Design a binder for this molecule. Structure first.
Ligand code: HEM
Ligand SMILES: [Ca+2]
Ligand SMILES: [K+]
Length: 267
Protein backbone atom coordinates (compact mmCIF):
# COMPACT_ATOMS: atom_id res chain seq x y z
CA UNK A 1 0.00 0.00 0.00
CA UNK A 2 2.99 2.36 -0.57
CA UNK A 3 4.51 2.14 -4.02
CA UNK A 4 8.30 1.91 -3.97
CA UNK A 5 10.28 4.21 -6.30
CA UNK A 6 11.50 1.20 -8.35
CA UNK A 7 9.20 -0.72 -10.68
CA UNK A 8 8.62 -3.69 -8.39
CA UNK A 9 6.30 -5.60 -10.77
CA UNK A 10 8.92 -5.46 -13.58
CA UNK A 11 11.73 -6.29 -11.15
CA UNK A 12 9.93 -9.40 -9.79
CA UNK A 13 9.45 -10.63 -13.39
CA UNK A 14 13.10 -10.03 -14.25
CA UNK A 15 14.13 -12.02 -11.17
CA UNK A 16 11.86 -14.91 -12.15
CA UNK A 17 13.37 -14.85 -15.68
CA UNK A 18 16.89 -14.88 -14.27
CA UNK A 19 16.04 -17.89 -12.11
CA UNK A 20 14.33 -19.64 -15.07
CA UNK A 21 17.71 -19.54 -16.88
CA UNK A 22 19.64 -20.90 -13.87
CA UNK A 23 17.38 -22.75 -11.41
CA UNK A 24 20.23 -23.31 -8.92
CA UNK A 25 20.31 -19.56 -8.38
CA UNK A 26 16.96 -19.74 -6.53
CA UNK A 27 18.33 -21.51 -3.42
CA UNK A 28 21.54 -19.40 -3.42
CA UNK A 29 19.44 -16.18 -3.32
CA UNK A 30 17.69 -17.49 -0.25
CA UNK A 31 21.03 -18.36 1.36
CA UNK A 32 22.32 -14.88 0.50
CA UNK A 33 19.43 -13.03 2.19
CA UNK A 34 19.62 -15.31 5.21
CA UNK A 35 23.36 -14.82 5.71
CA UNK A 36 23.01 -11.05 5.25
CA UNK A 37 20.51 -11.17 8.18
CA UNK A 38 22.40 -13.83 10.23
CA UNK A 39 25.13 -11.39 11.26
CA UNK A 40 22.71 -9.82 13.85
CA UNK A 41 23.13 -9.94 17.62
CA UNK A 42 19.87 -8.86 19.23
CA UNK A 43 21.48 -8.24 22.65
CA UNK A 44 24.37 -6.07 21.32
CA UNK A 45 22.04 -4.68 18.62
CA UNK A 46 24.93 -4.89 16.16
CA UNK A 47 26.18 -6.78 13.09
CA UNK A 48 24.33 -4.69 10.44
CA UNK A 49 21.78 -7.25 9.33
CA UNK A 50 19.74 -6.65 6.19
CA UNK A 51 22.00 -3.81 4.99
CA UNK A 52 23.90 -5.66 2.22
CA UNK A 53 26.95 -5.31 4.55
CA UNK A 54 28.25 -8.61 3.07
CA UNK A 55 29.32 -6.54 0.03
CA UNK A 56 32.30 -5.51 2.19
CA UNK A 57 35.39 -7.26 3.37
CA UNK A 58 35.83 -8.82 5.98
CA UNK A 59 32.24 -10.13 6.01
CA UNK A 60 32.31 -11.37 2.38
CA UNK A 61 35.37 -13.49 3.28
CA UNK A 62 33.94 -15.22 6.37
CA UNK A 63 33.98 -19.00 5.75
CA UNK A 64 30.21 -19.21 6.25
CA UNK A 65 29.66 -16.88 3.27
CA UNK A 66 31.80 -18.77 0.76
CA UNK A 67 30.15 -19.01 -2.66
CA UNK A 68 27.74 -16.15 -1.98
CA UNK A 69 29.59 -13.99 -4.52
CA UNK A 70 27.62 -15.95 -7.20
CA UNK A 71 24.14 -14.70 -6.26
CA UNK A 72 25.53 -11.19 -5.43
CA UNK A 73 27.09 -10.98 -8.91
CA UNK A 74 23.87 -12.16 -10.61
CA UNK A 75 21.88 -9.46 -8.84
CA UNK A 76 24.24 -6.68 -10.06
CA UNK A 77 22.62 -6.67 -13.51
CA UNK A 78 19.29 -5.98 -11.94
CA UNK A 79 20.68 -3.24 -9.67
CA UNK A 80 21.97 -1.50 -12.81
CA UNK A 81 18.51 -1.73 -14.45
CA UNK A 82 16.67 -0.69 -11.22
CA UNK A 83 18.97 1.92 -9.67
CA UNK A 84 16.40 3.15 -7.14
CA UNK A 85 16.33 -0.14 -5.15
CA UNK A 86 18.97 -0.62 -2.43
CA UNK A 87 21.13 -3.77 -2.59
CA UNK A 88 19.64 -4.71 0.77
CA UNK A 89 16.03 -4.60 -0.53
CA UNK A 90 17.09 -6.30 -3.77
CA UNK A 91 18.65 -9.25 -1.94
CA UNK A 92 15.57 -9.67 0.23
CA UNK A 93 13.11 -9.31 -2.65
CA UNK A 94 15.04 -11.80 -4.79
CA UNK A 95 14.88 -14.34 -1.93
CA UNK A 96 11.13 -13.78 -1.61
CA UNK A 97 10.73 -14.15 -5.38
CA UNK A 98 12.80 -17.37 -5.29
CA UNK A 99 10.75 -18.86 -2.46
CA UNK A 100 7.45 -18.26 -4.26
CA UNK A 101 8.86 -19.37 -7.63
CA UNK A 102 9.90 -22.76 -6.20
CA UNK A 103 6.36 -23.23 -4.86
CA UNK A 104 6.80 -21.75 -1.35
CA UNK A 105 4.70 -19.07 0.44
CA UNK A 106 4.19 -15.55 -0.97
CA UNK A 107 5.76 -13.47 1.82
CA UNK A 108 4.54 -9.86 2.25
CA UNK A 109 7.44 -7.63 1.32
CA UNK A 110 8.40 -4.34 2.98
CA UNK A 111 10.87 -2.01 1.28
CA UNK A 112 13.23 0.74 2.48
CA UNK A 113 16.31 -1.04 3.82
CA UNK A 114 19.34 1.25 3.64
CA UNK A 115 22.66 -0.08 2.38
CA UNK A 116 25.75 -0.12 4.55
CA UNK A 117 28.05 2.69 3.30
CA UNK A 118 31.32 1.14 4.49
CA UNK A 119 32.67 -2.03 6.20
CA UNK A 120 33.06 -0.46 9.67
CA UNK A 121 29.48 -1.57 10.48
CA UNK A 122 30.35 -5.26 9.85
CA UNK A 123 30.13 -7.57 12.82
CA UNK A 124 32.80 -10.15 13.68
CA UNK A 125 33.23 -13.63 12.25
CA UNK A 126 31.67 -16.51 14.15
CA UNK A 127 28.07 -15.23 13.91
CA UNK A 128 27.04 -17.72 11.20
CA UNK A 129 26.09 -21.24 12.21
CA UNK A 130 28.43 -24.19 11.68
CA UNK A 131 26.90 -27.30 10.10
CA UNK A 132 29.35 -29.59 11.92
CA UNK A 133 27.88 -28.66 15.30
CA UNK A 134 24.61 -29.65 16.93
CA UNK A 135 21.76 -28.32 19.05
CA UNK A 136 23.70 -26.54 21.79
CA UNK A 137 25.38 -24.46 19.04
CA UNK A 138 22.23 -24.05 16.87
CA UNK A 139 20.20 -22.83 19.84
CA UNK A 140 22.96 -20.38 20.84
CA UNK A 141 22.97 -18.81 17.36
CA UNK A 142 19.22 -18.61 17.00
CA UNK A 143 18.76 -17.18 20.51
CA UNK A 144 21.41 -14.56 19.58
CA UNK A 145 19.27 -13.65 16.59
CA UNK A 146 16.12 -13.36 18.73
CA UNK A 147 14.27 -16.51 17.54
CA UNK A 148 12.47 -19.15 19.57
CA UNK A 149 12.71 -22.92 19.00
CA UNK A 150 9.59 -22.99 16.75
CA UNK A 151 11.02 -20.26 14.50
CA UNK A 152 14.49 -21.93 14.44
CA UNK A 153 13.09 -25.18 13.14
CA UNK A 154 10.81 -23.49 10.56
CA UNK A 155 13.72 -21.46 9.15
CA UNK A 156 16.12 -24.44 8.83
CA UNK A 157 13.31 -25.94 6.74
CA UNK A 158 14.68 -23.91 3.82
CA UNK A 159 17.05 -26.82 3.27
CA UNK A 160 14.09 -28.24 1.44
CA UNK A 161 15.78 -26.62 -1.53
CA UNK A 162 19.31 -26.30 -2.91
CA UNK A 163 22.34 -28.37 -2.08
CA UNK A 164 25.77 -28.35 -0.52
CA UNK A 165 28.90 -27.77 -2.61
CA UNK A 166 32.29 -29.21 -1.64
CA UNK A 167 34.08 -26.05 -2.80
CA UNK A 168 31.93 -23.79 -0.55
CA UNK A 169 31.16 -25.65 2.69
CA UNK A 170 32.96 -29.00 2.28
CA UNK A 171 29.65 -30.83 2.30
CA UNK A 172 28.05 -32.42 -0.74
CA UNK A 173 24.55 -32.92 -2.14
CA UNK A 174 20.87 -31.96 -1.83
CA UNK A 175 18.69 -32.64 1.22
CA UNK A 176 15.60 -33.72 -0.72
CA UNK A 177 14.59 -35.39 -3.98
CA UNK A 178 13.43 -32.17 -5.50
CA UNK A 179 16.02 -29.49 -4.71
CA UNK A 180 14.00 -27.07 -6.82
CA UNK A 181 10.82 -27.41 -4.74
CA UNK A 182 9.96 -25.40 -1.65
CA UNK A 183 7.79 -27.37 0.80
CA UNK A 184 7.99 -29.39 4.05
CA UNK A 185 9.96 -32.26 2.48
CA UNK A 186 13.13 -31.51 4.51
CA UNK A 187 11.17 -32.47 7.64
CA UNK A 188 9.54 -35.46 5.95
CA UNK A 189 12.96 -36.80 4.90
CA UNK A 190 14.56 -36.01 8.26
CA UNK A 191 11.81 -37.96 10.11
CA UNK A 192 11.12 -40.78 7.67
CA UNK A 193 14.55 -41.90 6.50
CA UNK A 194 17.26 -43.93 8.17
CA UNK A 195 20.26 -41.58 8.29
CA UNK A 196 23.58 -43.43 7.92
CA UNK A 197 27.18 -42.30 7.83
CA UNK A 198 28.30 -41.23 4.36
CA UNK A 199 31.61 -43.14 3.88
CA UNK A 200 33.01 -40.93 1.10
CA UNK A 201 32.67 -37.33 2.24
CA UNK A 202 35.59 -36.24 4.37
CA UNK A 203 33.51 -33.76 6.40
CA UNK A 204 31.06 -35.91 8.38
CA UNK A 205 27.55 -36.00 6.88
CA UNK A 206 24.66 -38.44 6.76
CA UNK A 207 22.88 -40.04 3.81
CA UNK A 208 19.58 -41.87 3.52
CA UNK A 209 19.79 -45.68 3.58
CA UNK A 210 16.96 -45.96 1.04
CA UNK A 211 18.63 -44.25 -1.98
CA UNK A 212 21.89 -42.70 -0.62
CA UNK A 213 21.16 -39.62 -2.78
CA UNK A 214 19.99 -37.35 0.04
CA UNK A 215 22.07 -35.70 2.78
CA UNK A 216 21.74 -34.27 6.26
CA UNK A 217 24.30 -32.22 8.22
CA UNK A 218 25.00 -32.75 11.96
CA UNK A 219 23.12 -29.44 12.46
CA UNK A 220 20.07 -30.84 10.56
CA UNK A 221 19.86 -34.10 12.52
CA UNK A 222 20.25 -32.26 15.84
CA UNK A 223 16.63 -31.09 15.20
CA UNK A 224 15.64 -34.77 15.70
CA UNK A 225 17.94 -35.34 18.69
CA UNK A 226 16.79 -32.32 20.70
CA UNK A 227 13.28 -33.06 22.13
CA UNK A 228 12.18 -29.40 21.89
CA UNK A 229 13.16 -29.15 18.24
CA UNK A 230 11.77 -32.59 17.38
CA UNK A 231 8.22 -31.49 18.21
CA UNK A 232 8.47 -28.84 15.47
CA UNK A 233 10.09 -31.19 12.97
CA UNK A 234 7.08 -33.46 13.54
CA UNK A 235 4.60 -30.57 13.28
CA UNK A 236 5.99 -29.45 9.92
CA UNK A 237 6.51 -32.96 8.48
CA UNK A 238 2.76 -33.64 8.95
CA UNK A 239 1.45 -30.17 8.05
CA UNK A 240 2.82 -28.40 5.00
CA UNK A 241 0.32 -25.56 5.33
CA UNK A 242 1.50 -24.82 8.88
CA UNK A 243 5.11 -25.02 7.57
CA UNK A 244 4.44 -22.50 4.77
CA UNK A 245 2.77 -20.10 7.23
CA UNK A 246 5.43 -20.40 9.91
CA UNK A 247 8.28 -20.18 7.46
CA UNK A 248 6.75 -17.03 5.89
CA UNK A 249 6.40 -15.34 9.25
CA UNK A 250 9.90 -16.30 10.47
CA UNK A 251 11.67 -15.44 7.23
CA UNK A 252 9.88 -12.10 7.12
CA UNK A 253 11.01 -11.54 10.73
CA UNK A 254 14.58 -12.56 9.81
CA UNK A 255 14.82 -10.18 6.82
CA UNK A 256 13.45 -7.36 8.92
CA UNK A 257 15.87 -7.72 11.85
CA UNK A 258 17.64 -4.52 12.79
CA UNK A 259 15.68 -2.52 10.20
CA UNK A 260 13.81 0.77 10.53
CA UNK A 261 11.46 2.92 8.51
CA UNK A 262 10.22 0.14 6.19
CA UNK A 263 7.08 0.44 3.98
CA UNK A 264 4.55 -2.18 2.87
CA UNK A 265 4.85 -2.96 -0.83
CA UNK A 266 1.73 -3.64 -2.96
CA UNK A 267 0.86 -7.35 -3.42
C1 HEM B 1 21.75 -24.41 11.82
C2 HEM B 1 21.58 -23.43 10.91
C3 HEM B 1 22.13 -23.61 9.48
C4 HEM B 1 23.23 -24.26 9.11
C5 HEM B 1 24.31 -24.86 10.03
C6 HEM B 1 23.29 -24.22 7.66
C7 HEM B 1 24.28 -24.73 6.87
C8 HEM B 1 24.33 -24.75 5.49
C9 HEM B 1 25.38 -25.33 4.66
C10 HEM B 1 26.67 -26.02 5.18
C11 HEM B 1 25.03 -25.15 3.38
C12 HEM B 1 25.81 -25.54 2.10
C13 HEM B 1 26.45 -24.29 1.49
C14 HEM B 1 27.12 -24.68 0.18
O1 HEM B 1 28.02 -25.56 0.23
O2 HEM B 1 26.79 -24.11 -0.90
C15 HEM B 1 23.75 -24.47 3.36
C16 HEM B 1 23.05 -24.14 2.21
C17 HEM B 1 21.83 -23.53 2.15
N1 HEM B 1 21.18 -22.93 3.21
FE1 HEM B 1 21.61 -23.39 5.25
N2 HEM B 1 22.14 -23.60 7.21
C18 HEM B 1 21.41 -23.20 8.29
C19 HEM B 1 20.22 -22.51 8.26
C20 HEM B 1 19.62 -22.02 7.10
C21 HEM B 1 18.52 -21.09 7.06
C22 HEM B 1 17.86 -20.50 8.32
C23 HEM B 1 18.23 -20.84 5.76
C24 HEM B 1 17.14 -19.91 5.18
C25 HEM B 1 16.01 -19.59 5.81
C26 HEM B 1 19.15 -21.61 4.96
C27 HEM B 1 19.11 -21.65 3.58
C28 HEM B 1 20.00 -22.33 2.79
C29 HEM B 1 19.78 -22.64 1.41
C30 HEM B 1 18.58 -22.27 0.52
C31 HEM B 1 20.98 -23.41 0.98
C32 HEM B 1 21.24 -23.97 -0.43
C33 HEM B 1 22.18 -22.98 -1.14
C34 HEM B 1 22.46 -23.39 -2.58
O3 HEM B 1 21.84 -24.33 -3.10
O4 HEM B 1 23.30 -22.71 -3.23
N3 HEM B 1 19.97 -22.32 5.80
N4 HEM B 1 23.33 -24.29 4.66
CA1 LIG C 1 25.05 -8.21 7.31
K1 LIG D 1 12.18 -30.01 -1.79
Amino acid sequence: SEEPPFDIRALRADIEDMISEKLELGPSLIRLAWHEAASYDCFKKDGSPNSASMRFKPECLYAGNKGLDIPRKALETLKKKYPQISYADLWVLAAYVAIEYMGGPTIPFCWGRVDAKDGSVCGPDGRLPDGSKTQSHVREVFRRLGFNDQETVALIGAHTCGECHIEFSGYHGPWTHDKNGFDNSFFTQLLDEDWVLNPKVEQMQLMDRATTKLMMLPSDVCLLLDPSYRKYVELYAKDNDRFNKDFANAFKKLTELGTRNLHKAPA
